[PDB]
Nucleic acid binder design. Structure first.
Lengths: 67, 107, 57, 223, 96
RNA sequence: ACGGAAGGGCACCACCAGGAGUGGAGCCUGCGGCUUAAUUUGACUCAACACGGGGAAACUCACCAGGUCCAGACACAAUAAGGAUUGACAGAUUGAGAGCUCUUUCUUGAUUUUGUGGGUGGUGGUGCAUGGCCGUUCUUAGUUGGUGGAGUGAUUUGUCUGCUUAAUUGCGAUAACGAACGAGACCUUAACCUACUAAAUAGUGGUGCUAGCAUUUGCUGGUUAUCCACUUCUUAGAGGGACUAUCGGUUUCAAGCCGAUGGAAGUUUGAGGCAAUAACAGGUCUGUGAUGCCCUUAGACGUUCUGGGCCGCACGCGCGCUACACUGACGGAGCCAGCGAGUCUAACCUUGGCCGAGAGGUCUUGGUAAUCUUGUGAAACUCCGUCGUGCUGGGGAUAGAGCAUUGUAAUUAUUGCUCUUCAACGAGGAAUUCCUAGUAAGCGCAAGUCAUCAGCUUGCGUUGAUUACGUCCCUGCCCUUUGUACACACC
């Protein structure tokens, strides 16, 4: 099952919260951004984080989300 | 005045890939640093020495097997060179764990 | 050991730790017959030390 | 010689095994913490990570002579083919083996079990270790055996970081009543690291941005 | 043990010279590496030497590692009758 | 903590829907039983019984009939340099060319003998004294602490009705808020890369050189270096790549889940490695020179040598192997893999040439290995025949005879070969195991073991289906609620 772990969603949260004046609804540039901003020891982890902060980014564009 | 070309092959062989690629790449780089003729690091298909064993010291229990492995990585670099520079390159670039063997040969 | 005395243990234990460090600090800077064996047997390799004479018929 | 490289590498491993065993036996009360062997031209080099090199030397280099001669004659070496170096280990309080030996000799000097383990964990922690633990399994004065965990600080238990960070050691101390085993665990600070990954795969630091002073009508600057 | 005094002399001398002996746990070995005797003769003579506090014995991996002790330097001095301050690997080699 | 009390879940060691079977047969093999000089022993529901890596001719070896040796450190004492003690030719004796013992009488020299204490060895006992290790709970999801709320307190909330995941995985509700171990991350392997670095130990294209057939140019090979070039395939280093993406269904429009599209790959990408806290008198003193205690220690329970035995056979049980044939046996012929491994103080992997029906012999050879065995020319399988449903040419048990190989030794028959003998078994009662995709099952290898022996196992590739994509009925286990006079915790 693709329930993203706590560390993922936590990170994504922080990131959208402090870098909305950047990012987009595009995974690639969010991933690359992540690499230019967050020190992550794993590619896989960073892609999970970027993908989730991407989905969140899409679903913030049509309304607010708690947190 | 010594100095004359003898077709040399060096084989590096070890289990510690970091030190191995360390000394290998350093050897090819620091060699060609002064314009020799070479065929640079050749990778031989890495060896997996396996061992299969019952985890148990005795006989009891569900039959749980375990598989240990040791991995042998083996490289070789071909260098055409005189006498001094080889002796110099085998004297230094020494690595604990990385086994170096310096052949001359042609048959 | 028992729990009724627990503190005590820790304290002494902790003190021990401190003591160790002091030692670790103390150590941080703190404060002929030649002759040999083969050569002595070879230095005494001069004779006058054997006897043999026999074989009869 | 003339062996295959497989058999040679395995043989080398076995050589290390018998080596470490032998030193561990011989250099017990001298803080032996491990060896390393190095194949060089001329010689083969054996380095002794201890905490008491003053004894590993002996009466002006008598005992180290003994050990060299031992290893030599046993493994069939030609005098000079082998050279041993006694060397101090940095931070005894980050080596499992050193601590296992420590508490072993604590209890062998008849110190309180609790005070021994607690003193050990204390010294290990005060040497700036991320986390530590001492399991004690066996029988103490009773008859029905028991076990005891003494752990302070942070340790992880799963995955590759195990290999990367925590240090395990088992030591069999034997006394008038029976035997008992010491299981020591030391998690070293991933931060310091030096060589290898400097942080847990878990870790994800976010770099803190900056308060901007935006606005301001355009303009340009010339150089 | 029960061995002619010749082999005993080979042993005691050799040990006196090297200060260190080794011997695998395998009796019935006819002849020992280096020393000119039965392996068992060496192992047992050594056992005798240690169990009177003249030498130290260690094992690990089917091999006996024998260290000579200072008191044992006294007794072996007497047994080899050589003068005080005699021999043993107690002289720091040539310069190595 | 437990219930022979209630409500929920999860799971092919649970059903469903199916598949291939086992259970019946022959043999192989372990366990019991019996038998026995001995038939050494641990283990008996899942979690004992093709398990102790346990495929025992010696060895192994612990058992039985017998024979040597001390390898009984050390201390005191006693014997005694008129000799403390060792050895032995032949004979008698013994399985034995054991001077074990005795006949006889040379030898040896203080190394031994006797005695006491004290040691030691022991696959002797105790896994109900221990370490360590392992198995189980567990195909599990649980453990904790900071500030805050409740309680005098032990303690409680966080750690929760619901929903959602493989997950204390999340979302959400909310006196809790924000974390840490564990899950996840991570590591390993199979998948992608005409992108980088390359290579006679990998391979391709061209050219030399050369054979065959066509001949009009061509088609099909040879030539461990004749040169030149390359890196698609092969190899392994650094990278990139997937984040369930894009769209859209569905649900508290939350986590997510479903479907289409794209994609090397969208079931945790497939498969593994690790893996917290706690428990069991689970297993192991027959792995250890790991070990407490007890027992034994010279007519030995030490050790070694000879021979036998663990294989003994009215019978019960478990893992299996081969089969009942025609989607087949046979005989020709086609002809294709991947994981491996191989000889220094040695005889390992062995091509090739001869000899033999065969097994095998013999003469050489390459290879310490991407280089040689080896493209491991494996088997199911494909193709053309022969047989024609008849215990048949399906099936190969039992058995007689002959040749070889391993080995000091093969009889109770190690294995291999050839001729003959031609059993039971006509799909298998009640019961019962395993399994959801390159999986099942069918097929053969290689490796472990190994002098010789796989009907075993660990891996491996070859051929390649059917049926779900669900549930709580059987079972097993988790979780709350509840009771408790248990807490050494329903043994």
């Amino acid at each position: 099952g693709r329930v993203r772990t706590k560390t993922v969603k936590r990170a994504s949260k922080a990131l959208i919260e402090r870098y909305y004046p950047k990012l987009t609804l595009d995974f690639q540039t969010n991933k690359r951004l992540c690499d230019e901003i967050a020190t992550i020891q794993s590619k896989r982890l960073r892609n999970k984080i970027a993908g989730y902060t991407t989905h969140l980014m899409k679903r913030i564009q049509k309304g607010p989300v708690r947190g | 005045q010594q100095q004359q070309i003898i077709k040399i092959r060096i084989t590096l062989t070890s289990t510690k890939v970091k030190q191995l690629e360390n000394v290998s790449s350093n050897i090819v780089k620091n060699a060609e640093q002064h314009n020799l003729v070479k065929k640079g690091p050749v990778r031989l298909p890495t060896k997996v020495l396996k061992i299969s064993t019952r985890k148990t010291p005795n006989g009891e229990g569900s039959k749980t097997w375990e598989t240990y492995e040791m991995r042998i990585h083996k490289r070789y670099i071909d260098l055409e060179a005189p006498v001094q520079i080889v002796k110099r390159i085998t004297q230094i670039t020494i690595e604990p764990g990385v086994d170096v063997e310096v052949v001359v040969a042609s048959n | 050991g028992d729990d009724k005395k627990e503190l005590s243990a820790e304290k002494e234990a902790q003190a021990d730790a401190a003591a160790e460090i002091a030692e670790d600090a103390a150590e941080a800077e703190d404060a002929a017959k030649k002759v040999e064996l083969d050569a002595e047997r070879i230095e005494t390799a001069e004779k006058e030390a054997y006897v043999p004479a026999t074989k009869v018929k | 010689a003339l062996i295959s490289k497989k058999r040679k590498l395995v043989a080398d491993g076995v050589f290390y095994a018998e080596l470490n065993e032998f030193f561990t036996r011989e250099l017990a009360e001298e803080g032996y913490s491990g060896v390393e062997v190095r194949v060089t031209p001329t010689k083969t080099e054996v380095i002794i990570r201890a905490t008491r090199t003053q004894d590993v030397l002996g009466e002006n280099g008598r005992r180290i002579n003994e050990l060299t001669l031992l290893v030599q004659k046993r493994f069939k070496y030609a005098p000079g083919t082998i050279v041993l170096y006694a060397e101090r280990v940095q931070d005894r309080g980050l080596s499992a083996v050193a601590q296992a030996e420590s508490m072993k000799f604590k209890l062998l000097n008849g110190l309180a079990i609790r005070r021994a383990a607690y003193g050990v964990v204390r010294y290990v922690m005060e040497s700036g270790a991320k986390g530590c633990e001492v399991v004690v399994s066996g029988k103490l004065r009773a008859a029905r055996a028991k076990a005891m965990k003494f752990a302070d600080g942070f340790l992880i238990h799963s995955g590759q970081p195990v290999n990367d960070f925590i240090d395990t050691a088992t030591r069999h101390v034997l006394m008038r009543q029976g035997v008992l085993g010491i299981k020591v665990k030391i998690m070293r600070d991933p931060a310091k690291s030096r060589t290898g990954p400097k942080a847990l795969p878990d870790a994800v630091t976010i770099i803190e941005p900056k308060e901007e002073e935006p606005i301001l009508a355009p303009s340009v600057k010339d150089y | 043990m029960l061995m002619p005094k010749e082999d005993r002399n080979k042993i005691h001398q050799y040990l006196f010279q090297e200060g260190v002996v080794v011997a695998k746990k395998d009796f019935n070995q006819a002849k020992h590496e280096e020393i000119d005797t039965k392996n068992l003769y060496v192992i047992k003579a050594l056992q005798s030497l240690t169990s009177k506090g003249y030498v130290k014995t260690q094992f690990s991996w089917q091999y006996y590692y024998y260290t000579l002790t200072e008191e044992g330097v006294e007794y072996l001095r007497e047994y080899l009758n050589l003068p005080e301050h005699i021999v043993p690997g107690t002289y720091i080699q040539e310069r190595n």
